[PDB]
């Protein structure tokens, strides 16, 4: 497992960089246990049950839908994602994308003027990139 790049550098240079003129609102790399590996300045503080609900939907897709994607006390409505890989949520003009790696979770929160496809693109790429090292 490569230890040469800091998780702070990953979120700063691959999650919060400019894409199509816009920026993510907040981003974080978090373990499946709930330990945040790195997070931007304005990323919310999770609650333990919120992460467990996220993880239960990854284990059985469609189980978080009645409850909603709860991140930092904020309720997002779950929308379509990839089973066992990506969980997405919408809160009006904003939203969030949670991408699953082998050991961690990549999370990006956007608000207008950012499209959901751009938040999807950046977050999921770093997800796939780290899955391909075993991370």
């Amino acid at each position, epitope marked *: 497992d490569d230890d*040469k*790049m800091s998780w702070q*550098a990953y979120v700063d*240079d691959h999650l919060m960089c*400019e*894409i199509e003129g816009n920026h993510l609102s907040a981003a974080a790399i978090i373990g499946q246990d709930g330990s945040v590996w790195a997070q931007s300045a304005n990323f919310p503080q999770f609650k333990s049950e919120e992460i467990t609900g996220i993880m239960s939907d990854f284990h059985e897709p469609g189980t978080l839908a009645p409850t909603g994607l709860y991140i930092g006390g904020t309720k997002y409505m779950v929308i379509q994602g990839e089973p066992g890989a990506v969980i997405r949520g919408k809160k009006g003009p904003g939203g969030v994308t949670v991408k699953k790696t082998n050991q961690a979770l990549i999370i990006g929160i956007y608000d207008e003027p950012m499209t959901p496809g751009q938040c999807n693109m950046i977050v999921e*790429r770093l997800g796939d*990139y780290l899955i391909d*090292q075993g991370y």
Partner: antibody, heavy 116, light 108 residues
Framework: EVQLVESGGGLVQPKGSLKLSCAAS????????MNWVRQAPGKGLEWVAR??????????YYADSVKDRFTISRDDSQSMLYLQMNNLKTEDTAMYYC???????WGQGTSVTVSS | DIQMTQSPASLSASVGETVTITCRAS??????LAWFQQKQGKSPQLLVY???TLADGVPSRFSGSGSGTQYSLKINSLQPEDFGSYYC?????????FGGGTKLEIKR
């Protein structure tokens, strides 16, 4: 510790087929995505294929140059990578390396000449 | 597809001098760029992975720089073992295209 050893290269007449192999040792092969990269005799490098881990259903991505002719596969039970080549053209004559993820470790290379 | 254009093609410098090889993408690769050095008769070797992260066993005279569509590799205090060619490769989206290469001769 990490060592990639290619094999299978050789001389093949045009429109032929050939199956290169790559043996990986020194790391958990199942947790990494693998590449095939080739270099023409005097020219530069060109990326031709990539395969993913079991987590993403062993997805495969090819270059348009070799899009409908080449096939990349892997046997994680034996820590082996394969490149299947069909309808070999003159433009395929090159040296072929297996590459791990973004290029941390390359292989010795196996040479392939397509000529009459 | 994101094609990449490297420059210059050839560079010659006496030992002790400093050179930079610039590499440009047709779109934002969002700092998913790696640098490889290759010598005649041998396989390439990774110098800088991602925009600025040096790989294991690489001298610190290699500074990886860049952002957006333009990146560069700086070699300060050039040493005689730095001859060869240098290729840049992006990993944003498939195809993971290589570059044209920059052959470095050592003025002597």
């Amino acid at each position: 510790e990490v060592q990639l050893v290619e094999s299978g290269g050789g001389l093949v007449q045009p429109k032929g087929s050939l199956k290169l192999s790559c043996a990986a040792s020194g790391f958990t092969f199942n947790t990494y995505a693998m590449n095939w990269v080739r270099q023409a005799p005097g020219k530069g490098l060109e990326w031709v294929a990539r395969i993913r881990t079991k987590t993403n259903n062993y997805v495969t991505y090819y270059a348009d140059s070799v899009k409908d002719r080449f096939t990349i596969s892997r046997d994680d039970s034996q820590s082996m990578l394969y490149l299947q080549m069909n309808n070999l053209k003159t433009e395929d004559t090159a040296m072929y390396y297996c590459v791990r993820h973004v290029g941390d470790y390359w292989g010795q290379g196996t040479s392939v000449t397509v000529s009459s | 597809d994101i094609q990449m254009t490297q420059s210059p093609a050839s560079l010659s410098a006496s030992v002790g001098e400093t050179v930079t090889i610039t590499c440009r993408a047709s779109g934002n690769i969002h700092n998913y760029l790696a640098w490889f050095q290759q010598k005649q008769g041998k396989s390439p070797q990774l110098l800088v992975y991602n925009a600025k992260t040096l790989a294991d066993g690489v001298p610190s005279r290699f500074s990886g720089s860049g952002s957006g569509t333009q990146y560069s590799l700086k070699i300060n205090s050039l040493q005689p073992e730095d001859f060869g060619s240098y290729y840049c490769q992006h990993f944003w989206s498939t195809p993971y295209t290589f570059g044209g290469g920059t052959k470095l001769e050592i003025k002597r």
